[PDB]
Amino acid sequence: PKRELEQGVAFSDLCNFLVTPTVQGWKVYWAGLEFDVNQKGITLLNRLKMTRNLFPHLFKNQQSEVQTPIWALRVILAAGILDQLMPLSGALNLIADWLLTTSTNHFNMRTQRVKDQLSMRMLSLIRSNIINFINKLETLHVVNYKGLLSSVEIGTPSYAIIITRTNMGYLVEVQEPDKSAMRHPGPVKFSLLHESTLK
Protein backbone atom coordinates (compact mmCIF):
# COMPACT_ATOMS: atom_id res chain seq x y z
CA PRO A 1 0.00 0.00 0.00
CA LYS A 2 1.44 3.33 -1.16
CA ARG A 3 0.50 5.18 2.00
CA GLU A 4 2.10 2.31 3.95
CA LEU A 5 5.44 2.46 2.14
CA GLU A 6 5.53 6.28 2.32
CA GLN A 7 4.76 6.34 6.06
CA GLY A 8 7.24 3.54 6.66
CA VAL A 9 10.08 5.62 5.23
CA ALA A 10 8.98 8.91 6.81
CA PHE A 11 8.57 7.25 10.24
CA SER A 12 11.95 5.60 9.93
CA ASP A 13 13.79 8.78 8.85
CA LEU A 14 12.10 11.31 11.14
CA CYS A 15 11.71 9.28 14.34
CA ASN A 16 15.22 7.87 14.50
CA PHE A 17 18.09 10.25 15.29
CA LEU A 18 20.91 7.96 14.27
CA VAL A 19 24.32 8.37 15.82
CA THR A 20 27.42 6.42 14.89
CA PRO A 21 30.79 6.79 16.57
CA THR A 22 33.72 7.53 14.28
CA VAL A 23 37.43 8.25 14.50
CA GLN A 24 37.09 12.04 14.78
CA GLY A 25 33.77 12.15 16.63
CA TRP A 26 30.28 11.17 15.46
CA LYS A 27 28.25 10.68 12.30
CA VAL A 28 24.66 11.82 12.66
CA TYR A 29 22.00 10.70 10.23
CA TRP A 30 18.52 12.16 10.54
CA ALA A 31 15.72 13.10 8.11
CA GLY A 32 17.96 11.79 5.31
CA LEU A 33 20.59 14.39 6.21
CA GLU A 34 24.15 13.45 7.14
CA PHE A 35 26.49 15.34 9.52
CA ASP A 36 30.07 14.78 10.63
CA VAL A 37 30.33 16.17 14.18
CA ASN A 38 33.89 16.30 15.53
CA GLN A 39 35.18 16.69 19.11
CA LYS A 40 37.30 19.78 18.40
CA GLY A 41 36.34 22.94 20.27
CA ILE A 42 35.12 20.74 23.12
CA THR A 43 38.04 21.29 25.51
CA LEU A 44 38.34 25.01 24.69
CA LEU A 45 34.88 25.72 26.08
CA ASN A 46 35.68 24.05 29.42
CA ARG A 47 38.94 26.00 29.60
CA LEU A 48 37.21 29.37 29.06
CA LYS A 49 34.64 28.78 31.82
CA MET A 50 39.19 38.49 25.04
CA THR A 51 36.42 36.06 24.11
CA ARG A 52 35.79 35.30 27.78
CA ASN A 53 34.69 38.90 28.34
CA LEU A 54 32.56 39.01 25.20
CA PHE A 55 30.19 36.27 26.31
CA PRO A 56 30.27 36.69 30.09
CA HIS A 57 26.78 35.22 30.30
CA LEU A 58 28.36 31.96 29.04
CA PHE A 59 31.91 31.97 30.41
CA LYS A 60 31.77 34.09 33.62
CA ASN A 61 28.56 32.55 34.95
CA GLN A 62 28.15 29.56 37.24
CA GLN A 63 24.65 29.03 35.82
CA SER A 64 25.86 28.30 32.26
CA GLU A 65 26.34 24.67 31.30
CA VAL A 66 28.49 23.43 28.38
CA GLN A 67 26.74 20.76 26.27
CA THR A 68 27.97 18.09 23.84
CA PRO A 69 28.53 19.00 20.14
CA ILE A 70 25.67 16.61 19.25
CA TRP A 71 23.42 18.71 21.48
CA ALA A 72 24.54 21.76 19.54
CA LEU A 73 23.66 20.01 16.22
CA ARG A 74 20.24 19.07 17.60
CA VAL A 75 19.63 22.72 18.57
CA ILE A 76 20.58 23.77 15.07
CA LEU A 77 18.14 21.23 13.56
CA ALA A 78 15.28 22.39 15.80
CA ALA A 79 16.06 26.01 15.03
CA GLY A 80 16.10 25.17 11.35
CA ILE A 81 12.57 23.87 11.70
CA LEU A 82 11.27 26.74 13.83
CA ASP A 83 12.82 29.57 11.85
CA GLN A 84 10.36 29.47 8.97
CA LEU A 85 7.62 28.16 11.21
CA MET A 86 7.23 31.55 12.93
CA PRO A 87 -0.64 23.00 7.09
CA LEU A 88 0.20 21.09 10.27
CA SER A 89 2.91 22.89 12.19
CA GLY A 90 1.84 20.91 15.25
CA ALA A 91 3.90 17.93 14.14
CA LEU A 92 6.82 20.12 13.13
CA ASN A 93 6.81 21.87 16.52
CA LEU A 94 6.66 18.57 18.37
CA ILE A 95 9.64 17.31 16.36
CA ALA A 96 11.66 20.47 17.02
CA ASP A 97 10.88 20.17 20.75
CA TRP A 98 11.99 16.56 20.88
CA LEU A 99 15.25 17.52 19.18
CA LEU A 100 16.03 20.48 21.39
CA THR A 101 14.76 19.45 24.89
CA THR A 102 15.86 15.80 24.92
CA SER A 103 18.79 13.57 24.06
CA THR A 104 16.78 10.48 22.94
CA ASN A 105 17.49 8.90 19.55
CA HIS A 106 13.88 7.84 19.02
CA PHE A 107 10.81 10.05 18.67
CA ASN A 108 7.77 8.62 20.45
CA MET A 109 4.73 9.71 18.49
CA ARG A 110 2.26 10.12 21.34
CA THR A 111 -0.93 10.89 19.41
CA GLN A 112 -2.28 9.16 16.32
CA ARG A 113 -2.77 12.55 14.66
CA VAL A 114 1.00 13.09 14.80
CA LYS A 115 1.61 9.68 13.23
CA ASP A 116 -0.90 10.47 10.45
CA GLN A 117 1.05 13.61 9.63
CA LEU A 118 4.33 11.80 8.94
CA SER A 119 4.51 11.80 5.13
CA MET A 120 6.88 12.34 2.18
CA ARG A 121 5.67 15.93 2.15
CA MET A 122 6.59 16.40 5.84
CA LEU A 123 10.03 14.88 5.32
CA SER A 124 10.50 17.11 2.34
CA LEU A 125 9.43 20.31 4.12
CA ILE A 126 11.67 19.58 7.13
CA ARG A 127 14.70 18.88 4.89
CA SER A 128 14.11 22.03 2.95
CA ASN A 129 13.70 24.12 6.15
CA ILE A 130 16.91 22.76 7.61
CA ILE A 131 18.88 23.30 4.40
CA ASN A 132 17.57 26.83 4.01
CA PHE A 133 18.52 27.52 7.61
CA ILE A 134 22.02 26.10 7.16
CA ASN A 135 22.53 28.35 4.11
CA LYS A 136 21.41 31.35 6.17
CA LEU A 137 23.90 30.44 8.92
CA GLU A 138 26.66 30.15 6.30
CA THR A 139 25.99 33.75 5.35
CA LEU A 140 26.84 34.92 8.90
CA HIS A 141 30.10 36.80 9.38
CA VAL A 142 32.47 36.02 12.23
CA VAL A 143 32.11 38.43 15.19
CA ASN A 144 33.32 41.87 13.99
CA TYR A 145 33.83 45.60 14.55
CA LYS A 146 31.99 46.71 11.42
CA GLY A 147 28.24 46.26 11.56
CA LEU A 148 28.02 42.83 9.84
CA LEU A 149 25.45 40.21 10.95
CA SER A 150 26.95 37.43 13.15
CA SER A 151 23.98 35.98 15.05
CA VAL A 152 20.51 34.66 14.52
CA GLU A 153 17.91 34.31 17.21
CA ILE A 154 14.86 32.06 17.23
CA GLY A 155 12.46 33.02 19.99
CA THR A 156 9.64 30.81 21.25
CA PRO A 157 7.35 30.81 24.33
CA SER A 158 9.28 27.90 25.85
CA TYR A 159 12.86 29.01 25.03
CA ALA A 160 15.13 31.37 23.10
CA ILE A 161 17.83 30.05 20.72
CA ILE A 162 20.89 32.11 19.82
CA ILE A 163 23.51 31.05 17.32
CA THR A 164 26.66 33.10 16.81
CA ARG A 165 29.47 32.91 14.28
CA THR A 166 32.93 33.07 15.87
CA ASN A 167 36.47 32.36 14.71
CA MET A 168 36.12 28.92 16.31
CA GLY A 169 32.75 27.83 14.92
CA TYR A 170 29.07 28.35 15.68
CA LEU A 171 28.41 29.09 19.33
CA VAL A 172 25.06 27.56 20.10
CA GLU A 173 23.03 28.67 23.10
CA VAL A 174 19.56 28.12 24.55
CA GLN A 175 18.34 30.58 27.21
CA GLU A 176 14.96 30.94 28.92
CA PRO A 177 12.33 32.73 26.76
CA ASP A 178 12.88 35.93 28.78
CA LYS A 179 16.68 35.85 28.26
CA SER A 180 17.36 35.95 32.01
CA ALA A 181 20.98 35.09 31.30
CA MET A 182 21.21 38.23 29.14
CA ARG A 183 22.92 41.14 35.47
CA HIS A 184 21.20 38.87 35.55
CA PRO A 185 23.03 35.53 35.74
CA GLY A 186 20.08 33.49 34.43
CA PRO A 187 20.61 29.87 33.37
CA VAL A 188 21.83 29.06 29.85
CA LYS A 189 22.99 25.96 27.97
CA PHE A 190 25.64 26.20 25.28
CA SER A 191 28.17 24.54 23.01
CA LEU A 192 30.33 24.94 19.92
CA LEU A 193 29.79 23.28 16.54
CA HIS A 194 32.80 23.44 14.20
CA GLU A 195 32.12 25.03 10.76
CA SER A 196 33.04 21.87 8.86
CA THR A 197 29.97 20.18 10.37
CA LEU A 198 27.50 22.16 8.23
CA LYS A 199 29.31 21.67 4.89
Author numbering: 13 to 61, 71 to 107, 114 to 209, 212 to 228
Passage from the reporting paper:
In order to provide 3D templates for understanding VP24 and its many roles in immune evasion, replication and assembly, we crystallized VP24 from Sudan virus (two versions crystallized: SUDV1–233 and SUDV11–233) and Reston virus (one version crystallized: RESTV11–237). We determined the structure of SUDV11–233 at 2.1 Å resolution by multiwavelength anomalous diffraction (MAD) using selenomethionine-incorporated protein expressed recombinantly in E. coli. Crystal structures presented here include VP24 from an ebolavirus that is pathogenic to humans (Sudan virus; SUDV) and VP24 from an ebolavirus that thus far, appears nonpathogenic to humans (Reston virus; RESTV), although it is lethal to nonhuman primates. The overall folds of SUDV and RESTV VP24 are similar, as expected (r.m.s.d. of 0.81 Å; also see Figure S2b for structural alignment). The entrance to the hydrophobic cavity (11 Å wide) appears to be gated by two residues (Y172 and M71) that point away from each other in RESTV VP24 but toward each other in SUDV VP24, appearing to block the hydrophobic cavity. Crystal packing can sometimes illustrate biologically relevant assemblies, but no tetrameric or other higher oligomeric interactions are observed in crystals of SUDV or RESTV VP24. One pairwise VP24-VP24 interaction is conserved in the crystal packing between the SUDV (P3121) and RESTV VP24 (P1211) structures, although it is currently unclear if it is biologically relevant. This interaction involves α1, β1–3 and the N-terminal region of α8, and buries residue L147 that was previously implicated for virulence, although 142–146 remain solvent exposed. Another crystal lattice interaction observed in both RESTV and SUDV structures involves packing of the hydrophobic N-terminal regions of VP24 into the Face 3 pocket of a neighboring molecule.
